[PDB]
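Worked example (supplementary).
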Amino acid sequence: SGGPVPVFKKYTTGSKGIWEKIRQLLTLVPNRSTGNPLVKNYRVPPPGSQTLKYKDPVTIPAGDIVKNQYYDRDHRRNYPRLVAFDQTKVSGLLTLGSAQNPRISVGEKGQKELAVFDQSVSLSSTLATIDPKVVKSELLAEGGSPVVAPSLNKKMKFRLTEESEHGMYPEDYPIRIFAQN
Amino acid sequence: TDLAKELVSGAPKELITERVARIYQEAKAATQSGQHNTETWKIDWDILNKGNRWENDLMGYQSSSDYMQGTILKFDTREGAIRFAKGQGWDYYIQEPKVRRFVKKDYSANFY
Amino acid sequence: EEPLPVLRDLPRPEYGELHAPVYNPAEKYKEQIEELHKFGRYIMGCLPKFVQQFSVWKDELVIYVAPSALTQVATFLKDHTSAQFKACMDVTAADYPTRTNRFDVVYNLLSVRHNSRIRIKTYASEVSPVPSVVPLFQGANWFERETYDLFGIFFEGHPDLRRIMTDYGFQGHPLRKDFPTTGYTEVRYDAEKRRVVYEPLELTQAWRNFTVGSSVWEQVGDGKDFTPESFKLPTPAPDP
Amino acid sequence: EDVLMDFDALKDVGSGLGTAAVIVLNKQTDIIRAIQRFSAFYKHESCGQCTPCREGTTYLQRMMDRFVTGQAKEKEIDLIYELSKEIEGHTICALGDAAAWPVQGLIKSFRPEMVERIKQYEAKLGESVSYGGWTSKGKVLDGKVVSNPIPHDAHHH
Amino acid sequence: KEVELTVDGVKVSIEAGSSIIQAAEKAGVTIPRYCYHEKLAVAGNCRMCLVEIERSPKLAASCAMPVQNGMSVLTNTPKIKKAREGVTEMLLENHPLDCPVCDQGGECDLQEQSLRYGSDRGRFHEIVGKRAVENKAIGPLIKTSMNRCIHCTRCVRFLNDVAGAPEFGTAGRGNDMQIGTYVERNVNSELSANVIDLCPVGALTSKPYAFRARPWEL
Amino acid sequence: STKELTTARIKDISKPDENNLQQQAPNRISPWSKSQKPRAEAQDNVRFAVKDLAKQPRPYAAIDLIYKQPIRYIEHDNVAVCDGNGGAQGHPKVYINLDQNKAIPCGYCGLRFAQAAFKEDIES
Ligand code: SF4
Ligand code: SF4
Ligand code: SF4
Ligand code: FES
Ligand SMILES: [K+]
Ligand SMILES: [Zn+2]
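After joint prediction of all chains, the assembly is encoded as:
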């Protein structure tokens, strides 16, 4: 956790000998670092004088010579097509059901019905004349309940912590720290 | 459409009086065999009879006083371009693209 | 009081060949696609008089309404408990001169309630006014002030509409496609007049249009179908 | 063991009775060099108009010569198999199909032999060879590949 | 006369005897090609226009296969896209790394089709090296860098048939096939320089225009 | 003179002098491009009226330097491979064909490669 750390465990220059004892006797919080980085540790091999020979990293499926056809991993051309649902298609889905839950006849009798919603069908009329169970089953939810706005993050929850856990300002300060839960 | 919409655009008067725009569809390039840049209609302005480009004396740049030299508009229907040109009150002229004439091509024709 | 480790010298993990799964990034939005589709339809059913159409892309739901349907749909999405979009984040536009109404005014609403975002699209022409949402959302005062400055859209009902970005007495609305990127004029300090004066534009190096060398081949295909299997009209099966 | 000379019975086991030039060998020979010689034959005899066989038959030839000396990598054994599939079905005349089948024949039935050849060369040379044959120190100096085993196996001539 | 066919679900009505690629180009489906030009005789050697026909195992050169009636033509099967990347991986096996110094840089069909239809990685690290050819001198107007030729015969078909200059042809066999004039002689036609536009790659470029501009500037 | 100082030549005529400020480069008199502006005309300008022409940048002309290199000669192979003698810090690897009886320069580096068997005729 983020508990206080002894000063000699931080990479900054610190006093030694008699001055260390003076520094601990006079400072308010003896484990506060001066902030001057250790000359012998900080950036000691400069970025231009390293020893690591860099190698280009390549994950196997997308960098392999084999089993690596580009059309498998060509996601830029598998983008979701843009589909706009007008009132007419909503009516057609509402009256005829969906592809998963068909409510359309078969053969030429069905092909008659689909062609009905192949041209303009205002949705105001469709709701006026249809089974009230359809709205409770298709349009609304859970037996007539409304459709709440969907959440971008179903795992977004919060909970209240206390200073013994979040380490920040005590209870008197006018802010509260929220965890995940 | 019918309104003199240019009176609200704040554009300088010279685009109405002194410049000529062109409505055209870009032609297919001889070098490459692609046929995609020739499917959208574009509007470009004619160059100026003087002061379109002149050599900067110091560094040899290409100075210009034409503020429409790097302005090309894009459309997807020919009518939208003409309607938009009409709305602004532009003195345009349309360049009808050429249409390639169909000729059937057969592998066997090399001997027959 | 042990001496500090030299983090340069401490051992590092060894890896052989790395493996990372390849899968379509658009798949992980699948659950979000259905729920926006349901909630998009819900708004249309509640207000068939206004919602022309609705569209879903990944995790973004758009509602397309007329200019005369703006205040109604905005109010519904603000006050309805199922969709409490109290916060309006963005008001903007876009210029498509090919269409009869070039300007396309877009609103983004945020629901801190249910952790959702919705988008309203409403068109406009150069002279046709659009209702102002300032009476509903006070945060649109400056977003509408900016759209007029850069698109010239008439906003009906705005308490104080004026230039916010461009100079005072600036002629023309910059983000319209017909407005050249370098504008029409430029300023300099004139010795005779003892003041900074405007002069017509004259570039020492004319802008170079490298955009002509664009691709002559179509670069991205027709796309892929990701509609939920509960929002497609069923195919009438053949008879015996 | 039960091979019966037919236009199709030999086809079931992947081969065929094309010109009935039945060849019988013994275990005291290296089939890698024998198949390599067929690859250098179809290359030298391909007319050279279709792209897959004008170039791909050179792709096979440039790789079997590294196979016959074992200067390759173990995964490159199945790399050349993917090459042979890129040739078949794309050419005008059946010479392209006839240049890829012998490559599959070596891989299909004599796979461990190619691996042993590569494992020999690792021990024989002492330093493992990367993709394409490049040793750790192989580079280009004043216009020639240096510090690397160059396979002058293109008939020299 | 016209035969009604569908290409990827798009109904096509063309004159009978036409090739598949013209039918596809009328339906809007784009079929990549190098060796097919709409003013030249049909050769079927570049093998890039391959499609799949419903009643066949064998891929069809859509630039050569004449159209049928009721035929179903596929162009976007995973089988086809595998073929397009295979062919692309073959043309670039011997192609030089010349794009920076190549006058065809921003307008080369071997670049745009490879970008669109080929893979994004190359699998050729061979130690023997690529094929090298000597540049042939055929006059003061055509600058030849024959390392870059993809052996598509547009130059040969144009000069023989359209231009009427039979001194240009393919000399050699297989991996040593060398477009040119065999002996050293200049190409003599008033229309000889149109070959510069037909050559899809930097093999034949303008000599007066050499090294002076890139196509995105103009 | 102003005859060599204003026209480009493949090779100069007189020996270049480093102190002559009118030369195109300190190691070359005449320009090396048809469209390169001569240095004599470039500095005959008002902006140079009160300058010190000896301190203006005068990099050594690269055309004269590159022809001071020897020709690489390849042994029993007609194809040279060049990569800029730096690998990942050079130019892309390009293969040069040496069938013709001449020294073919590299497209990027400008190094000239030939065959050993052709050296005697080339060195004539
Ligand atoms: S497949 Fe046949 S026709 Fe095509 S290049 Fe090879 S040998 Fe010639
Ligand atoms: S022809 Fe095209 S692919 Fe080949 S070097 Fe030139 S630009 Fe590159
Ligand atoms: S030189 Fe050009 S036009 Fe002629 S075959 Fe080669 S790529 Fe085609
Ligand atoms: S375009 Fe058909 S094979 Fe070349
Ligand atoms: K060319
Ligand atoms: Zn070089």
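Two points are worth noting when inspecting this output. Helices of chain A lie at 18-26, 60-63, 87-96, 107-116, 123-128, 132-139, 163-166. Chains A and B do not touch (no CB pair under 8 Å).
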